[PDB]
Amino acid sequence: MQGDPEVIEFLNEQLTAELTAINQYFLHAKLQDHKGWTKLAKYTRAESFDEMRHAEVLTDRILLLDGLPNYQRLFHVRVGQSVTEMFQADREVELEAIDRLRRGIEVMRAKHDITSANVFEAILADEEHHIDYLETQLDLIEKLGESLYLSTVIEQTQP
Amino acid sequence: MQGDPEVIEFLNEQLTAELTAINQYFLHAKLQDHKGWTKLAKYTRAESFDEMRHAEVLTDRILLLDGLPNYQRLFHVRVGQSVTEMFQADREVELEAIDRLRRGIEVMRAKHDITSANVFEAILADEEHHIDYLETQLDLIEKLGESLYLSTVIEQT
Amino acid sequence: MQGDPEVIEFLNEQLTAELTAINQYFLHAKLQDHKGWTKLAKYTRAESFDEMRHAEVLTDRILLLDGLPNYQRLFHVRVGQSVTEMFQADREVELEAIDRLRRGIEVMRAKHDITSANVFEAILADEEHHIDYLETQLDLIEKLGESLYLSTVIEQTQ
Amino acid sequence: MQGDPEVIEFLNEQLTAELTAINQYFLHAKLQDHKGWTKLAKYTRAESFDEMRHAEVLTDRILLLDGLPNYQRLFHVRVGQSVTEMFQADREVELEAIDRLRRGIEVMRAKHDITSANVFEAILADEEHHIDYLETQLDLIEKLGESLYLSTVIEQTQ
Amino acid sequence: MQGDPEVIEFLNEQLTAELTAINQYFLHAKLQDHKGWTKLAKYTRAESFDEMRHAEVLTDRILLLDGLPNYQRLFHVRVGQSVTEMFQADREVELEAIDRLRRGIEVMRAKHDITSANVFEAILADEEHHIDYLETQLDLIEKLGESLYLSTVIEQT
Amino acid sequence: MQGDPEVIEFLNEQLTAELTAINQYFLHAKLQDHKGWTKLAKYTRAESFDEMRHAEVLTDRILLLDGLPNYQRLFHVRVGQSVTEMFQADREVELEAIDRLRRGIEVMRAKHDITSANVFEAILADEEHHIDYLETQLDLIEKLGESLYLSTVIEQT
Numbered sequence: 022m023q024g025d026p027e028v029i030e031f032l033n034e035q036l037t038a039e040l041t042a043i044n045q046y047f048l049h050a051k052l053q054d055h056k057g058w059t060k061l062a063k064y065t066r067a068e069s070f071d072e073m074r075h076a077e078v079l080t081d082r083i084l085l086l087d088g089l090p091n092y093q094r095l096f097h098v099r100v101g102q103s104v105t106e107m108f109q110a111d112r113e114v115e116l117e118a119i120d121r122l123r124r125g126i127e128v129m130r131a132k133h134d135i136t137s138a139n140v141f142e143a144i145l146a147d148e149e150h151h152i153d154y155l156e157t158q159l160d161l162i163e164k165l166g167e168s169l170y171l172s173t174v175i176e177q178t179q180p
Numbered sequence: 181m182q183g184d185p186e187v188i189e190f191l192n193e194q195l196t197a198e199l200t201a202i203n204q205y206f207l208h209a210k211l212q213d214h215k216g217w218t219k220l221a222k223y224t225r226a227e228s229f230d231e232m233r234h235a236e237v238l239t240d241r242i243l244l245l246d247g248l249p250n251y252q253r254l255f256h257v258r259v260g261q262s263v264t265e266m267f268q269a270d271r272e273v274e275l276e277a278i279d280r281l282r283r284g285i286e287v288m289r290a291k292h293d294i295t296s297a298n299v300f301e302a303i304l305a306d307e308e309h310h311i312d313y314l315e316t317q318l319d320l321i322e323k324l325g326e327s328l329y330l331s332t333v334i335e336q337t
Numbered sequence: 338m339q340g341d342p343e344v345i346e347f348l349n350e351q352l353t354a355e356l357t358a359i360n361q362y363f364l365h366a367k368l369q370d371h372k373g374w375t376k377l378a379k380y381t382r383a384e385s386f387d388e389m390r391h392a393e394v395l396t397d398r399i400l401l402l403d404g405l406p407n408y409q410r411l412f413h414v415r416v417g418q419s420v421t422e423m424f425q426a427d428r429e430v431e432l433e434a435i436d437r438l439r440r441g442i443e444v445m446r447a448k449h450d451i452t453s454a455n456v457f458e459a460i461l462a463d464e465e466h467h468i469d470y471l472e473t474q475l476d477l478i479e480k481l482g483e484s485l486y487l488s489t490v491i492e493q494t495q
Numbered sequence: 496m497q498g499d500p501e502v503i504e505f506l507n508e509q510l511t512a513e514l515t516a517i518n519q520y521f522l523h524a525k526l527q528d529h530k531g532w533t534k535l536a537k538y539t540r541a542e543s544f545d546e547m548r549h550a551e552v553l554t555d556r557i558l559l560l561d562g563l564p565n566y567q568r569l570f571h572v573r574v575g576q577s578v579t580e581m582f583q584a585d586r587e588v589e590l591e592a593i594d595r596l597r598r599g600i601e602v603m604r605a606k607h608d609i610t611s612a613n614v615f616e617a618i619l620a621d622e623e624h625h626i627d628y629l630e631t632q633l634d635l636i637e638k639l640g641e642s643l644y645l646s647t648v649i650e651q652t653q
Numbered sequence: 654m655q656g657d658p659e660v661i662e663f664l665n666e667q668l669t670a671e672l673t674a675i676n677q678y679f680l681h682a683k684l685q686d687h688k689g690w691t692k693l694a695k696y697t698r699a700e701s702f703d704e705m706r707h708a709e710v711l712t713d714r715i716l717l718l719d720g721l722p723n724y725q726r727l728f729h730v731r732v733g734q735s736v737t738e739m740f741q742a743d744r745e746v747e748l749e750a751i752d753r754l755r756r757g758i759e760v761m762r763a764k765h766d767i768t769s770a771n772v773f774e775a776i777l778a779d780e781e782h783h784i785d786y787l788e789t790q791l792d793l794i795e796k797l798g799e800s801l802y803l804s805t806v807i808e809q810t
Numbered sequence: 811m812q813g814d815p816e817v818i819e820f821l822n823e824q825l826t827a828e829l830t831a832i833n834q835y836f837l838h839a840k841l842q843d844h845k846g847w848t849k850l851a852k853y854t855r856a857e858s859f860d861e862m863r864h865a866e867v868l869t870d871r872i873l874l875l876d877g878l879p880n881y882q883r884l885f886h887v888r889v890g891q892s893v894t895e896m897f898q899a900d901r902e903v904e905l906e907a908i909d910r911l912r913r914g915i916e917v918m919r920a921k922h923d924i925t926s927a928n929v930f931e932a933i934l935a936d937e938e939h940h941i942d943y944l945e946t947q948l949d950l951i952e953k954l955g956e957s958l959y960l961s962t963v964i965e966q967t
């Protein structure tokens with residue numbers, strides 16, 4: 022029982038998205054943490070653990086197909102300065118992952134595995150359920166205005 | 181005992197208001213749910229369930245009068261895009277109900293049954309307790325301003 | 338992402354089945370309770386709310402596809418007088434559900450969305466459990482006889 | 496210490512009755528479950544596991560006599576469609592077991608083992624305790640009539 | 654609504670795998686029960702009930718398709734003497750199941766049922782989650798050695 | 811108050827060791843997880859999370875110095891096949907971190923900050939409490955021999 026290496030690569034190209042998404046959420050989480058924009062920092066910190074949960078079940082599956090996880094390669098990572106830029110860039114990153122997950126399942130359905138597609142749809146169902154929130158968030162600032170939007174995301178701590 | 185048919189349609193035209201008001205509340209409750217306006221979405225879900233409670237006690241009464249509920253015919257339903265139009269539209273819907281309910285009871289009390297008028301006033305007492313609320317709500321946006329009014333209706337959760 | 342309207346209308350014609358099924362279940366639930374037929378009216382009221390919430394998970398899907406729910410148009414609704422007629426009627430109503438749902442998902446799997454079809458099977462799996470039950474119930478009346486079948490559906494509770 | 500192969504086979508001929516009886520009870524338990532005949536399906540599922548508890552202690556016993564359990568051969572299994580003949584069919588299956596077990600224990604007492612026939616009587620006290628019950632059941636249908644007898648075993652589900 | 658017989662037989666040949674695997678797991682569990690290798694027999698008894706859980710949901714499906722379960726005929730069942738042979742033979746039995754499951758779901762997906770394939774994948778997901786553990790165990794012995802592998806399976810209790 | 815840039819890369823070259831260390835632990839932890847080498851797999855998962863506790867306060871330090879964390883580039887990561895190779899490889903990785911931590915604090919004390927060096931010693935106390943343990947582990951195999959050493963790592967559960 023050996024996985025077809027393209028299907029393995031179809032798993033593997035998903036994996037490079039995982040490691041980059043860990044750091045770009047977490048540093049931005051640590052970015053706003055100094056910036057005091059408090060409740061949104063609580064969101065992306067709790068969000069980042071789900072991709073840790075997303076990546077681990079990915080990691081087991083290729084071992085069931087007797088694969089070799091490359092944790093060495095990486096994609097390019099970006100940073101922003103205001104949150105709109107932070108909300109615009111990762112959208113493309115979330116726009117990046119879907120089509121790869123889209124194009125993977127149609128071909129892997131043609132090649133007789135069922136179980137790895139069940140992994141692939143499940144993570145794909147998360148991100149479409151994820152990206153809309155950002156799409157909800159951005160204009161909700163943008164129609165309203167950033168300053169009053171900034172005026173509600175902060176609070177003084179409990180010393 | 182047989183229900184008088186004139187009273188029966190007076191119950192019935194109220195029922196047509198009920199089913200239409202269910203959907204126009206609920207979809208607009210689901211509309212702001214996507215639009216992140218969290219707290220009023222909790223409120224509009226709470227308003228919809230009372231009309232669901234309003235309709236069932238309406239429903240059994242005509243069966244006591246041995247009637248046939250038309251759950252088939254409806255009235256025209258509208259939608260809005262900002263909240264103010266939604267607050268303007270349902271006002272007319274609330275303006276639609278009361279005067280017709282005002283029309284029914286006097287004619288009903290003229291014809292010797294008491295019991296459905298008790299249902300009439302009880303359902304009237306809610307909407308007169310309801311129509312003023314949005315009437316207070318809309319000017320409170322309008323005097324103040326919509327953008328800051330939007331600045332308190334959301335929640336990141 | 339914008340939903341393809343052929344998927345959207347196929348979501349939409351499911352919705353028209355949903356609203357009509359609410360009223361025909363509930364009124365017939367409000368039929369037999371006056372008729373004393375108690376536990377099936379408990380069952381029919383219990384049958385309503387699952388079919389209710391089936392439409393809500395239908396509803397929230399199409400706004401992700403940026404759609405406009407027609408909560409205005411309906412299908413034709415029927416009533417009966419004895420329960421056998423009701424059990425014959427809703428069978429056809431459930432007979433209308435599956436094949437159209439069967440007609441959809443093949444095309445939906447043919448057109449590069451997966452996520453909506455998971456709802457499509459999920460609403461299907463319920464009515465698989467539903468249509469046989471009423472199919473079971475009718476022969477129980479028919480092999481036995483209606484009168485003794487009425488002789489177990491009523492209690493002294495009012 | 497080695498078991499005498501006749502006694503082993505006489506233990507073994509019980510075992511063929513065991514696995515056959517498990518399926519013929521369980522499918523009928525699943526049959527009336529689809530047929531809605533509720534409490535008998537509760538009773539048939541409950542009666543089946545005692546036979547599962549029956550067969551396992553037989554399986555250890557031949558290992559104590561250092562035997563080889565044939566889990567391969569099976570006797571012929573039947574099925575019906577009405578409820579009555581199922582009570583007639585298993586009666587013969589109940590009639591099949593006892594006399595052969597009656598044939599054994601005399602020979603078991605004839606040949607200097609005590610312990611295996613203790614299992615034989617322990618299972619035989621069960622098989623008498625079944626055959627009377629179904630015999631009590633069937634005439635109670637038969638004197639009364641099937642339809643009113645059927646008119647008490649179905650009840651609604653949750 | 655009637656089940657298609659080619660779908661039905663595909664359920665049916667799966668069923669023959671069930672009853673054979675029940676006895677071969679259970680007796681070999683009862684084999685090491687004499688042989689004092691208790692913790693794997695604890696593993697074997699708990700594993701055997703899950704196939705009994707797999708078999709009943711197989712059974713109720715076909716009567717929804719209005720089918721007739723053949724609980725009558727079976728396939729050939731084997732026995733071993735050391736555990737490696739027991740680990741080698743059931744692997745083939747697990748190798749027997751999955752391709753037949755692979756052969757079924759491709760065809761019935763072309764033939765307009767969805768629901769029984771959901772049953773088929775669910776048991777198929779178990780066996781691929783099963784057969785690796787067999788494959789994990791057997792190489793772990795022969796790399797290490799059998800006698801020390803025997804040196805960890807008794808309990809004296 | 812601005813961080814002196816020489817301090818910043820000396821924080822940063824520690825950081826490049828950090829992200830590489832998590833994966834080489836975890837994948838090898840996931841390697842033995844398939845291999846049934848479970849009790850040390852429990853240990854290696856515990857080793858991963860402490861490094862996350864080490865790396866975060868490192869990241870919190872540099873923003874006080876107004877720094878830019880390069881989470882982008884890495885160092886070279888290796889894999890092994892038997893545990894001795896794994897215990898030999900990470901030893902060098904443990905040997906890699908200390909001298910950089912050693913060469914830091916002499917300069918960190920030399921240039922009028924204490925607080926970053928307080929982090930620098932606090933991380934350094936961990937690996938000296940760590941590299942001895944793995945050094946103890948490998949020789950404990952080495953006198954003994956791998957097979958009997960492996961013969962206690964299996965749980966069968």
Ligand code: HEM
Pocket residue numbers: 043047073074076077832833836859862863866
């Ligand atoms: C101060 C707290 C934490 C920090 C700074 C942190 C940070 C990180 C980072 C940077 C990664 C990516 C490294 C990698 O993927 O190998 C990661 C992965 C992970 N962490 Fe955390 N984490 C924290 C809390 C936790 C806790 C408390 C747990 C478990 C009880 C946990 C479980 C995991 C898991 C399962 C992964 C995925 C492993 C992997 O994909 O390689 N994390 N964490």
Ligand code: HEM
Pocket residue numbers: 202232233235236359363386388389390391392393394
């Ligand atoms: C003709 C009468 C009614 C109609 C048309 C109606 C309609 C609905 C609808 C559309 C939903 C959304 C479910 C979904 O999206 O899946 C719902 C939910 C619900 N229904 Fe009704 N309803 C009616 C009467 C009632 C009444 C009077 C009650 C209870 C006293 C009730 C019990 C419920 C409850 C409790 C929920 C909320 C379930 C939840 O929050 O999880 N229904 N109903």
Ligand code: HEM
Pocket residue numbers: 513514517518521544547548551566672675676679705706709724
């Ligand atoms: C929730 C509890 C149980 C379930 C779902 C279950 C399931 C089943 C079913 C349905 C069968 C019949 C299949 C057939 O023979 O065609 C079976 C066979 C069997 N049952 Fe169970 N059973 C349960 C309890 C038990 C227990 C607790 C034991 C033993 C301690 C047991 C012992 C057996 C044996 C040994 C067989 C195989 C018969 C043979 O090899 O001849 N059962 N199992």
Ligand SMILES: [Fe+2]
Pocket residue numbers: 072075144147148
């Ligand atoms: Fe993901």
Ligand SMILES: [Fe+2]
Pocket residue numbers: 230231234303306307
């Ligand atoms: Fe009302």
Ligand SMILES: [Fe+2]
Pocket residue numbers: 387388391460463464
């Ligand atoms: Fe439904």
Ligand SMILES: [Fe+2]
Pocket residue numbers: 545546549618621622
């Ligand atoms: Fe027995």
Ligand SMILES: [Fe+2]
Pocket residue numbers: 703704707776777779
């Ligand atoms: Fe299975």
Ligand SMILES: [Fe+2]
Pocket residue numbers: 828860861864865933
């Ligand atoms: Fe560290």
